[PDB]
mmCIF file with all atom_site columns, C-alpha atoms in Angstrom:
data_model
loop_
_atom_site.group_PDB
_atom_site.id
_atom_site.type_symbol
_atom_site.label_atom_id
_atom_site.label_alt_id
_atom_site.label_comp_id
_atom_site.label_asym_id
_atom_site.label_entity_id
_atom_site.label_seq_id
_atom_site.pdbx_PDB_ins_code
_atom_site.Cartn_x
_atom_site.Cartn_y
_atom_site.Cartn_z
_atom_site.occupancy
_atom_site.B_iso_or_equiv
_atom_site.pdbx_formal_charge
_atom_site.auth_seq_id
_atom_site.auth_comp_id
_atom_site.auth_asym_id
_atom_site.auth_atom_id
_atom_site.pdbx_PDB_model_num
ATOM 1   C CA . UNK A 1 1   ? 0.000  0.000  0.000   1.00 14.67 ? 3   UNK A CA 1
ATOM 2   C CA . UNK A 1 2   ? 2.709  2.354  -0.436  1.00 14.35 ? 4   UNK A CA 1
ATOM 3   C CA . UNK A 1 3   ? 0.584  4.267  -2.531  1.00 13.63 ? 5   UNK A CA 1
ATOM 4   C CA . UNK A 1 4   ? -1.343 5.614  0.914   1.00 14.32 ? 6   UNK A CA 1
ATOM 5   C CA . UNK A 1 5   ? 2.303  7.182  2.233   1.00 11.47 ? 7   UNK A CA 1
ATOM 6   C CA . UNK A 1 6   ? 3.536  9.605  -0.735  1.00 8.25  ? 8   UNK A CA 1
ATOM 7   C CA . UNK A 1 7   ? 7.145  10.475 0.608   1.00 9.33  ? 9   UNK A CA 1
ATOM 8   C CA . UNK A 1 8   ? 9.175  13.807 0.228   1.00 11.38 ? 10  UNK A CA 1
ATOM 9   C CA . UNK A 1 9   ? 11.036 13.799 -3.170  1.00 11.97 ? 11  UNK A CA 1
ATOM 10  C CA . UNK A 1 10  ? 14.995 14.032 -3.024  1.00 11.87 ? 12  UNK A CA 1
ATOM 11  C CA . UNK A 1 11  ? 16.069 14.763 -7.121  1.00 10.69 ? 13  UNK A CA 1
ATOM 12  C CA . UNK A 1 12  ? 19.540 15.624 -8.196  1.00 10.09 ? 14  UNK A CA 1
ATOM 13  C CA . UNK A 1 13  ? 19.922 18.550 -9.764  1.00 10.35 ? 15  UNK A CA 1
ATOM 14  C CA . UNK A 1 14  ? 22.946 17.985 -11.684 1.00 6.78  ? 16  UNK A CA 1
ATOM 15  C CA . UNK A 1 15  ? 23.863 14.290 -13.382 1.00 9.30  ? 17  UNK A CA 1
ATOM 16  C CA . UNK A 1 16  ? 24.222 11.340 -10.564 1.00 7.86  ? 18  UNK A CA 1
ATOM 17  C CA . UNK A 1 17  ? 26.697 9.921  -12.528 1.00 8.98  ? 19  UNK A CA 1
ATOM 18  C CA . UNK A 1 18  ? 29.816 11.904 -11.304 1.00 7.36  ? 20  UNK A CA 1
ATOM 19  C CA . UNK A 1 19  ? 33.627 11.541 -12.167 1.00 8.12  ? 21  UNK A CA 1
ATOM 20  C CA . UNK A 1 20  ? 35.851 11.249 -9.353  1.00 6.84  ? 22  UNK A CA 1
ATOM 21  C CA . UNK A 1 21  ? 36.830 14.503 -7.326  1.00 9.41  ? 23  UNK A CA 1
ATOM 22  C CA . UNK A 1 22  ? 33.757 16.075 -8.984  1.00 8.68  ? 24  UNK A CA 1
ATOM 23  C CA . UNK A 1 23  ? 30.528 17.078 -7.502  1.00 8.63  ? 25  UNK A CA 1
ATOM 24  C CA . UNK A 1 24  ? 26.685 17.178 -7.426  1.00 7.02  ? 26  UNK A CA 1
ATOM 25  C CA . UNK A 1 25  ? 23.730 19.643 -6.591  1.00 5.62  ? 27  UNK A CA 1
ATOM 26  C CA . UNK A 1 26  ? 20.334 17.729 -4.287  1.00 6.35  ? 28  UNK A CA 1
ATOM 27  C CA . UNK A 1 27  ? 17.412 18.888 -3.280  1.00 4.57  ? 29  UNK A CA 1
ATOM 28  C CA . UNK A 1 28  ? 14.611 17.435 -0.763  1.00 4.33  ? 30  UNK A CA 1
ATOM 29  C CA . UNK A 1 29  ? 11.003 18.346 -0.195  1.00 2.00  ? 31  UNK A CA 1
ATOM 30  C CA . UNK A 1 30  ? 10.674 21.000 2.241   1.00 2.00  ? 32  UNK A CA 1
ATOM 31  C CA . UNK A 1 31  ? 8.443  19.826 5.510   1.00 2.00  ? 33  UNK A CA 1
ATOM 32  C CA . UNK A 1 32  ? 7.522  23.033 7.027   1.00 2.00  ? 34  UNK A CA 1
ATOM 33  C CA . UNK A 1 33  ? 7.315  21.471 10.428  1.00 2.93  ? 35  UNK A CA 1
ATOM 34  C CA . UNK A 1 34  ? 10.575 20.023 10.505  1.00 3.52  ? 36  UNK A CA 1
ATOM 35  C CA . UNK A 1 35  ? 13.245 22.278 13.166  1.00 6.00  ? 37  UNK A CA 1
ATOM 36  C CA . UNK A 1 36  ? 16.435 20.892 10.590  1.00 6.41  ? 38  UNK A CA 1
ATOM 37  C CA . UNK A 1 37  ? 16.601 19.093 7.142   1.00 6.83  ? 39  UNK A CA 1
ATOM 38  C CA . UNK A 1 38  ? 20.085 17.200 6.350   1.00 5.46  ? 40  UNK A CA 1
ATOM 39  C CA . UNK A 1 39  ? 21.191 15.361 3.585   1.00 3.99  ? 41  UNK A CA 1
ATOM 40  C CA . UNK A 1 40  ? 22.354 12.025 4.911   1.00 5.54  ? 42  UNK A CA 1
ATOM 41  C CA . UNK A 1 41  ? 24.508 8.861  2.724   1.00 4.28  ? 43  UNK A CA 1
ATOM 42  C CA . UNK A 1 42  ? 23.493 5.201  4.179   1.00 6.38  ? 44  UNK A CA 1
ATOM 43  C CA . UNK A 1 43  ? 25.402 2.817  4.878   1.00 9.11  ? 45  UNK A CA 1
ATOM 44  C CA . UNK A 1 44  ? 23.732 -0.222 6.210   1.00 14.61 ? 46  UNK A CA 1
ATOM 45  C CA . UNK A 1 45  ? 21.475 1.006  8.733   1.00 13.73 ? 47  UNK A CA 1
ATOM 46  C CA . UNK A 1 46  ? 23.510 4.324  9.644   1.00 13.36 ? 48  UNK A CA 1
ATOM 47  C CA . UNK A 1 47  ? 23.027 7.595  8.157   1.00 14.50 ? 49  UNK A CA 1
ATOM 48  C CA . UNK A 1 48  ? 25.674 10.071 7.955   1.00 12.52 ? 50  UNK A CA 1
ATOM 49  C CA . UNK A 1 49  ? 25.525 13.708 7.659   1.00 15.04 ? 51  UNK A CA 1
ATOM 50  C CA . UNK A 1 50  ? 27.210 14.906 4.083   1.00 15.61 ? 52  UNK A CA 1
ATOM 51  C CA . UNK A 1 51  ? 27.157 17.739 1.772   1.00 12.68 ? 53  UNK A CA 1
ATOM 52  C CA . UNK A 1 52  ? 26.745 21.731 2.355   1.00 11.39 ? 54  UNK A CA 1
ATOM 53  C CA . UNK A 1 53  ? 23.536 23.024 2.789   1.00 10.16 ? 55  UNK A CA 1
ATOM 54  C CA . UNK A 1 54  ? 23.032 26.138 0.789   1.00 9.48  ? 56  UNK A CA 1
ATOM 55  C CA . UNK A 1 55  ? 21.913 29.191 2.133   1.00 11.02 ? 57  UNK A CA 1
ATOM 56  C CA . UNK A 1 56  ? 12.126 26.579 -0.509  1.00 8.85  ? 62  UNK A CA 1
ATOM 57  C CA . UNK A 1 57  ? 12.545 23.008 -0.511  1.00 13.40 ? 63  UNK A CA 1
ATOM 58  C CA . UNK A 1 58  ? 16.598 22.587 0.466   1.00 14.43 ? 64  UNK A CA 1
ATOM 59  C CA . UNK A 1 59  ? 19.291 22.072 -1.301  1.00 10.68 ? 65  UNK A CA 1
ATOM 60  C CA . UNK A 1 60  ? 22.523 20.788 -0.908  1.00 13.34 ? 66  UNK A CA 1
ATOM 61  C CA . UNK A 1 61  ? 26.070 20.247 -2.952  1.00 14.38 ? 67  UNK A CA 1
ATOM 62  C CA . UNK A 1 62  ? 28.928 17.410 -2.374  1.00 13.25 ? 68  UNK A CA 1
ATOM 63  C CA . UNK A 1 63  ? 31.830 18.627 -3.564  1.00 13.05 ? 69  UNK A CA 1
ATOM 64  C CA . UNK A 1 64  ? 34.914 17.252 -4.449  1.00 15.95 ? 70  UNK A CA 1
ATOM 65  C CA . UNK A 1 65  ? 33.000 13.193 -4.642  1.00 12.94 ? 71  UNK A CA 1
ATOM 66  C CA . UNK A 1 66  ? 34.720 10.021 -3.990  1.00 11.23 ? 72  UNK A CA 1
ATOM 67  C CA . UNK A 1 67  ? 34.116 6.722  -3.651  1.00 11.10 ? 73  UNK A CA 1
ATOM 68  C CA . UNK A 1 68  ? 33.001 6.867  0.130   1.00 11.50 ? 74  UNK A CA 1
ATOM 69  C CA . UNK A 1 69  ? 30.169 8.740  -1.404  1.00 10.65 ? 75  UNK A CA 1
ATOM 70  C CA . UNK A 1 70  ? 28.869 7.023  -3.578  1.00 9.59  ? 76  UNK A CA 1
ATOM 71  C CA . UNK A 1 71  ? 26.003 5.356  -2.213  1.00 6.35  ? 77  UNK A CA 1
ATOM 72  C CA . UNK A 1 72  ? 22.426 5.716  -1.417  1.00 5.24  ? 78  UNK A CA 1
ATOM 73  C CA . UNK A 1 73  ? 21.275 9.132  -0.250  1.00 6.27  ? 79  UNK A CA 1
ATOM 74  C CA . UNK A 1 74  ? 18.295 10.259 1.645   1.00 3.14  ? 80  UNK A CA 1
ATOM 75  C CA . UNK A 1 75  ? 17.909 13.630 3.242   1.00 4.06  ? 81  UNK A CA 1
ATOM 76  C CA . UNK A 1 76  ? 16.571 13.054 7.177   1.00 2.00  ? 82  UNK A CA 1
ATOM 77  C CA . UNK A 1 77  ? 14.053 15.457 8.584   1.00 2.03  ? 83  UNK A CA 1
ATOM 78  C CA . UNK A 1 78  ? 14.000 16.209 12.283  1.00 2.51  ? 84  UNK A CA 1
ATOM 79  C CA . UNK A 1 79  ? 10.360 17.618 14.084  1.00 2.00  ? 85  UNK A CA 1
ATOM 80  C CA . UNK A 1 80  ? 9.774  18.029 17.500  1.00 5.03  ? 86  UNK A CA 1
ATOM 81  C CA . UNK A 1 81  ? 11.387 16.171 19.682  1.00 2.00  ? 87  UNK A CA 1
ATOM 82  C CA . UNK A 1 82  ? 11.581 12.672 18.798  1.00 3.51  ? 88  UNK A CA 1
ATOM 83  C CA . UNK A 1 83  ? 10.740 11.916 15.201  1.00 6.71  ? 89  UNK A CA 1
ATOM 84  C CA . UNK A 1 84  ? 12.964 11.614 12.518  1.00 8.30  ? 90  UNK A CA 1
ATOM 85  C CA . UNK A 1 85  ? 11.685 10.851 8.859   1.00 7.96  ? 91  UNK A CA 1
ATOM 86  C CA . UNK A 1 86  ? 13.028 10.813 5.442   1.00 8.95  ? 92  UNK A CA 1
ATOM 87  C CA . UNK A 1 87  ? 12.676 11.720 1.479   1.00 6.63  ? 93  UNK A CA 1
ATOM 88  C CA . UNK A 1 88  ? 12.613 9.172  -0.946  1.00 5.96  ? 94  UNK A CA 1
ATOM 89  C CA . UNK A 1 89  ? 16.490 7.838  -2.055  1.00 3.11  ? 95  UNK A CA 1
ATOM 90  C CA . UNK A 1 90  ? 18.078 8.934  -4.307  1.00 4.06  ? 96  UNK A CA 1
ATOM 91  C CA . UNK A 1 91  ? 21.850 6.693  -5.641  1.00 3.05  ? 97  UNK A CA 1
ATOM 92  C CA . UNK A 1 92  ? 25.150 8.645  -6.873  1.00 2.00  ? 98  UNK A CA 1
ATOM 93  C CA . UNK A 1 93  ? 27.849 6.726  -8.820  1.00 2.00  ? 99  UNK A CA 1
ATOM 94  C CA . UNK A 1 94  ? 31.298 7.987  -8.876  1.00 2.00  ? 100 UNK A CA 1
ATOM 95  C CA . UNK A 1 95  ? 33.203 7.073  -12.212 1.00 2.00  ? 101 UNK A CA 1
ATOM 96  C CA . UNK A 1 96  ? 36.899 6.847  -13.218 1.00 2.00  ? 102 UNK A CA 1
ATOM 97  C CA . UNK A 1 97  ? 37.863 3.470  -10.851 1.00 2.00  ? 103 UNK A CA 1
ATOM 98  C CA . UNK A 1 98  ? 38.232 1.189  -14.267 1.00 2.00  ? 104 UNK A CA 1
ATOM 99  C CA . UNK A 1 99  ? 39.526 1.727  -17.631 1.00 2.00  ? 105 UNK A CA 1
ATOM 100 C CA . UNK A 1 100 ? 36.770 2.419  -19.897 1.00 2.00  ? 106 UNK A CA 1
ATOM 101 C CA . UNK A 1 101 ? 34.499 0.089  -21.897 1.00 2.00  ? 107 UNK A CA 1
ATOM 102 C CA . UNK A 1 102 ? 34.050 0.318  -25.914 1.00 3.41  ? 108 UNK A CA 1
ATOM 103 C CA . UNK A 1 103 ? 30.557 1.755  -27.402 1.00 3.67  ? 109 UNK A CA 1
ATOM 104 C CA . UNK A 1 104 ? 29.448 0.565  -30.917 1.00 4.17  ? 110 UNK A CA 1
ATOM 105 C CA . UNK A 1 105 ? 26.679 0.588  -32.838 1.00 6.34  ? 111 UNK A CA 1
ATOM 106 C CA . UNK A 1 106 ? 25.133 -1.468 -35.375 1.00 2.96  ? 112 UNK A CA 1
ATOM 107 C CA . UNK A 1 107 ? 23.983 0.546  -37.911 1.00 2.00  ? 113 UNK A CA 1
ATOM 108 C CA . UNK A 1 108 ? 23.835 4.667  -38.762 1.00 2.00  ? 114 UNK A CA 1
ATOM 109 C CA . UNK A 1 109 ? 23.484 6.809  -35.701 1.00 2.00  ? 115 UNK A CA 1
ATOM 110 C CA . UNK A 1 110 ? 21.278 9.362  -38.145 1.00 2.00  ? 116 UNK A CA 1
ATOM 111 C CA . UNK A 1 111 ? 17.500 7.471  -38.264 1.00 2.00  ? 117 UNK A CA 1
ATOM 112 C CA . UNK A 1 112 ? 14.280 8.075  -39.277 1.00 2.00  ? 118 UNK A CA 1
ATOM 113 C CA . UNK A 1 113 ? 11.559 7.653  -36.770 1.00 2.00  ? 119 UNK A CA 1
ATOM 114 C CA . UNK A 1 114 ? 10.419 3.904  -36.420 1.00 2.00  ? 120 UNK A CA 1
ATOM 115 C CA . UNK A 1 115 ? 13.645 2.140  -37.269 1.00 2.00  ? 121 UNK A CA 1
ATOM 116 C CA . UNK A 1 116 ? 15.555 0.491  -34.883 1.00 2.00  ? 122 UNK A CA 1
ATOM 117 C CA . UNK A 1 117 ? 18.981 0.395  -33.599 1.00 2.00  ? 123 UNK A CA 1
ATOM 118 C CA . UNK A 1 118 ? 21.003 -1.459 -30.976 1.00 2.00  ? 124 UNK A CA 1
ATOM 119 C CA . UNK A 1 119 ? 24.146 0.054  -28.947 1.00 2.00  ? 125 UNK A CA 1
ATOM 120 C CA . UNK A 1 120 ? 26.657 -2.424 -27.646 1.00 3.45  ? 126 UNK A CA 1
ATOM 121 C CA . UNK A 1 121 ? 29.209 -1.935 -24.402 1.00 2.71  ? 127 UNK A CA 1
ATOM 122 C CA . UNK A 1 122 ? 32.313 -4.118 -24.444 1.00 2.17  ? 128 UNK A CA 1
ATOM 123 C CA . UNK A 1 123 ? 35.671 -4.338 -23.014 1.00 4.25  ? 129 UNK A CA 1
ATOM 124 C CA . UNK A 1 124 ? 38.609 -5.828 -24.360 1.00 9.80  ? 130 UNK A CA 1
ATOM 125 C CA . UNK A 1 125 ? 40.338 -5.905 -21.074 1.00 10.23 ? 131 UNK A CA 1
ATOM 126 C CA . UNK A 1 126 ? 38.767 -6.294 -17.324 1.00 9.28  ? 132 UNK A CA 1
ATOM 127 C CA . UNK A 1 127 ? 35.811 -8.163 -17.873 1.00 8.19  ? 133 UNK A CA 1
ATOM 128 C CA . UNK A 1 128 ? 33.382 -6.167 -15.740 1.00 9.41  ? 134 UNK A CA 1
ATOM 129 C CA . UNK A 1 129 ? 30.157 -7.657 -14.354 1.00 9.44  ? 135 UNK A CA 1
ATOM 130 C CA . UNK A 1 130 ? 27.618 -5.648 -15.552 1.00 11.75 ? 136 UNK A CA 1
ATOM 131 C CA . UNK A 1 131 ? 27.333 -2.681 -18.189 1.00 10.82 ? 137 UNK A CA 1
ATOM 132 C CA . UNK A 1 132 ? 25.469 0.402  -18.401 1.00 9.32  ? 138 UNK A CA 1
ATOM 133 C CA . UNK A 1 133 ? 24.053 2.954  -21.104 1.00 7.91  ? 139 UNK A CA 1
ATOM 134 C CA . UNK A 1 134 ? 23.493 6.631  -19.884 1.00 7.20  ? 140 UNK A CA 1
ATOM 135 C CA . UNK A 1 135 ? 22.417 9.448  -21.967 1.00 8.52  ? 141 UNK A CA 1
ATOM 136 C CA . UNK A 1 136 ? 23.882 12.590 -21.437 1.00 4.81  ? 142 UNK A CA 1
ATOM 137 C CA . UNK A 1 137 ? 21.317 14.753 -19.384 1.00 4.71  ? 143 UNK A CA 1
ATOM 138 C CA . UNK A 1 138 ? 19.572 12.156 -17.642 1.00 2.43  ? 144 UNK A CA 1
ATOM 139 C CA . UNK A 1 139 ? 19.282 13.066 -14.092 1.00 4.08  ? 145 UNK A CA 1
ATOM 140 C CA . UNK A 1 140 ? 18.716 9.627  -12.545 1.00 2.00  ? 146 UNK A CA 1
ATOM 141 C CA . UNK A 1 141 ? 21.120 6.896  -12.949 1.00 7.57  ? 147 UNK A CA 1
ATOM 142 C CA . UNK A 1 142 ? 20.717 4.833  -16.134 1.00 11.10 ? 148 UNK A CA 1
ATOM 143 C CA . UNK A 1 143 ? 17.517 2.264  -16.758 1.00 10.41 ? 149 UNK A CA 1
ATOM 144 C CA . UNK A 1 144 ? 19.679 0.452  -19.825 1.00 10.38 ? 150 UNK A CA 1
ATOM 145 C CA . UNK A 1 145 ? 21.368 -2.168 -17.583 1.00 7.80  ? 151 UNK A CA 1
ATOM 146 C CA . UNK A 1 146 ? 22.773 -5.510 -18.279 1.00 9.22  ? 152 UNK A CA 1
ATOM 147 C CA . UNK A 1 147 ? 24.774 -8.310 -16.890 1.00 7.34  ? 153 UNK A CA 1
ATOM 148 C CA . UNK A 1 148 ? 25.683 -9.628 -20.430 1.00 7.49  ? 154 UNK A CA 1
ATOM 149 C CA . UNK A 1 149 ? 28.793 -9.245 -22.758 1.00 9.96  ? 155 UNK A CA 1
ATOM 150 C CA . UNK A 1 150 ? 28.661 -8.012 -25.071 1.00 10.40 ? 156 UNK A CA 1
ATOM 151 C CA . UNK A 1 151 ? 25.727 -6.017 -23.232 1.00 11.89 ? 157 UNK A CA 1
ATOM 152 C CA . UNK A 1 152 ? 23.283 -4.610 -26.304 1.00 13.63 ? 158 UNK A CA 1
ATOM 153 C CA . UNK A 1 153 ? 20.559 -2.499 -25.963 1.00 15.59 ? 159 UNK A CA 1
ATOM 154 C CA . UNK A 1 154 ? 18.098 -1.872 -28.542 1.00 18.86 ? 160 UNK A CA 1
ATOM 155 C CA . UNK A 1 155 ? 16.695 1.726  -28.346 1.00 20.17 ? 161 UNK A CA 1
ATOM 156 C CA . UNK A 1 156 ? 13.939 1.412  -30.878 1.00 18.36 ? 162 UNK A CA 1
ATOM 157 C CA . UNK A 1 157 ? 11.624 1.580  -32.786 1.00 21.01 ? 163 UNK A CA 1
ATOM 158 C CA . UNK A 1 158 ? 13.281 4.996  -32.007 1.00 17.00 ? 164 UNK A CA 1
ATOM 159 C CA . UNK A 1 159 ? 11.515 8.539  -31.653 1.00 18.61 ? 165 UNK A CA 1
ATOM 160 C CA . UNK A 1 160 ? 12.699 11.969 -30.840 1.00 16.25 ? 166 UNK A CA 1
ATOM 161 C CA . UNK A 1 161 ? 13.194 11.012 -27.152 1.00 16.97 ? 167 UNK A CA 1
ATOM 162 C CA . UNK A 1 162 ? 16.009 8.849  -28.353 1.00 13.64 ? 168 UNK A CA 1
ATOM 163 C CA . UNK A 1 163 ? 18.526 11.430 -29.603 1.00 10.43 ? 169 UNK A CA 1
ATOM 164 C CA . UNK A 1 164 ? 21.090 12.621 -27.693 1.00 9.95  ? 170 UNK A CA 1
ATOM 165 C CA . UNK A 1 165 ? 24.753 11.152 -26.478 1.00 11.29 ? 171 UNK A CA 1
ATOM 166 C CA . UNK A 1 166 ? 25.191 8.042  -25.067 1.00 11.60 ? 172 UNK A CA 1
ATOM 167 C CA . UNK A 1 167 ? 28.071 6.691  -22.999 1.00 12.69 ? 173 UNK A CA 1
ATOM 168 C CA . UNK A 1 168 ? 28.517 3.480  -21.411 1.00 14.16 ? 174 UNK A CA 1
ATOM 169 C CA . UNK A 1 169 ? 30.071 2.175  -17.732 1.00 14.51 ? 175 UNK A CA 1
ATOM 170 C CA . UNK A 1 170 ? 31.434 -0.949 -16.701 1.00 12.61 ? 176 UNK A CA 1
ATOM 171 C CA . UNK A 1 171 ? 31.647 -2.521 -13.178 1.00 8.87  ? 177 UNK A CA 1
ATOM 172 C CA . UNK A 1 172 ? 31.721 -5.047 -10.963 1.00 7.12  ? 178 UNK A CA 1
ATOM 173 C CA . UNK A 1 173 ? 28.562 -6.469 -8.846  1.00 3.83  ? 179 UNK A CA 1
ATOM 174 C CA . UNK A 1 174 ? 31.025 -6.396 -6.024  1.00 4.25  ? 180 UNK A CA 1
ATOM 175 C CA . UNK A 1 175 ? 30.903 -2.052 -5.891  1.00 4.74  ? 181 UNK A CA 1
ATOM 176 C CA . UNK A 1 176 ? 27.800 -1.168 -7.074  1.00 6.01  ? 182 UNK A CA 1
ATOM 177 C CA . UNK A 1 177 ? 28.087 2.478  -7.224  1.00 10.06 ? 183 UNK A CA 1
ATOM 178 C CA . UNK A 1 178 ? 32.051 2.778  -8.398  1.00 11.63 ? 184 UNK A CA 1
ATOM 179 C CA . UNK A 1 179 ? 31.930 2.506  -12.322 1.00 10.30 ? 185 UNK A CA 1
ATOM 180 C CA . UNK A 1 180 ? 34.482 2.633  -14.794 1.00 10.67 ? 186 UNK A CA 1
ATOM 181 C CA . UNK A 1 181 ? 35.588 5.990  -16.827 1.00 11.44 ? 187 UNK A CA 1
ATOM 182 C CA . UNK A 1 182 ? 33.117 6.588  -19.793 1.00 10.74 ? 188 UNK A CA 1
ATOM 183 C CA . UNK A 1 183 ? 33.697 4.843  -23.342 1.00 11.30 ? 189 UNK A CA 1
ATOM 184 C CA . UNK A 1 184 ? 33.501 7.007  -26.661 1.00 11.71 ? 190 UNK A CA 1
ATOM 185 C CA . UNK A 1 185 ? 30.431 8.644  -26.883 1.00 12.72 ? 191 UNK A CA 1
ATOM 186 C CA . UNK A 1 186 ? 28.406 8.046  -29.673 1.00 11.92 ? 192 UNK A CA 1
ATOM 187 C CA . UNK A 1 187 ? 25.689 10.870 -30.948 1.00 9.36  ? 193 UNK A CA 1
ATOM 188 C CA . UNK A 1 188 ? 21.809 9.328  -32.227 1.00 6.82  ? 194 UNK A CA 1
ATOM 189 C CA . UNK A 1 189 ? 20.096 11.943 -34.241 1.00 6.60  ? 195 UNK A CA 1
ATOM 190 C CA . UNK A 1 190 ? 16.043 10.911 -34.873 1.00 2.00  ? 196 UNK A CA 1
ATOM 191 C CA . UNK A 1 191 ? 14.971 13.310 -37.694 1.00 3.75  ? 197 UNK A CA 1
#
């Protein structure tokens, strides 16, 4: 029934996918009640402040990200004097722990609307778990996932959603959230 318990949203504001040393931009659903609203990474069952809260639903930045935060976020929300509740979770990956994975394609990267066209992530050297395909702008982490390789992933019968650049990530089930530097980028034009 989780239907009858909306949550406050967390969203990132800036791409979850984040290279080493770089950084991010989050904001939570403002609960008016609430006396302080922090942006907390878990780990297991412990949540741990992180982030600068800027100084209106609140938003923070994590600068300078590494692999101790990449993770599972949730910002905790303090009211009265002993309840603590949360926003929805949101997941950061930090990239740049594995050489890079190869991107091709199997046909044109210009299409008309209808035809289809499948993108494949391989690597000729660690053989990484599982692949994913991110398109540049996407502020959630990818839905294109797969534990096969060659991983493919057909994106049609394509439409004007489709274009954009794509990039894809290897890893290893064992790290969830650190992913490999980006391979080539490859452009997909619908028109």
């Amino acid at each position: 029934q989780e239907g009858d318990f909306p949550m406050p949203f967390i969203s990132a504001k800036s791409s979850p996918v984040i290279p080493l040393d770089g950084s991010v931009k989050i904001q939570c659903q403002a609960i008016r009640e609430a006396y302080l609203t922090q942006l907390m990474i878990i780990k297991n069952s412990t949540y741990r402040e992180i982030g600068r809260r800027l100084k209106t639903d609140p938003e923070f930045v994590i600068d300078h990200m590494d692999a101790n935060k990449a993770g599972r976020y949730q910002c905790q929300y303090r009211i009265g004097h002993y309840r603590f509740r949360y926003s929805d979770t949101l997941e950061l990956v930090v990239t740049g722990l594995y050489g890079k994975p190869f991107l091709s394609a199997d046909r044109g990267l210009v299409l008309m609307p209808g035809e289809n066209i499948s993108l494949t992530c391989s690597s000729a050297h660690i053989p990484f778990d599982r692949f994913s395909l991110a398109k540049e702008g996407e502020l959630s982490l990818p839905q294109h996932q797969s534990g096969e390789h060659p991983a493919n992933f057909s994106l049609g019968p394509v439409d004007l959603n489709v274009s954009g650049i794509y990039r894809c990530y290897g890893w290893y089930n064992r790290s969830p959230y650190l992913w490999s530097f980006p391979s080539n980028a490859l452009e997909l034009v619908v028109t």
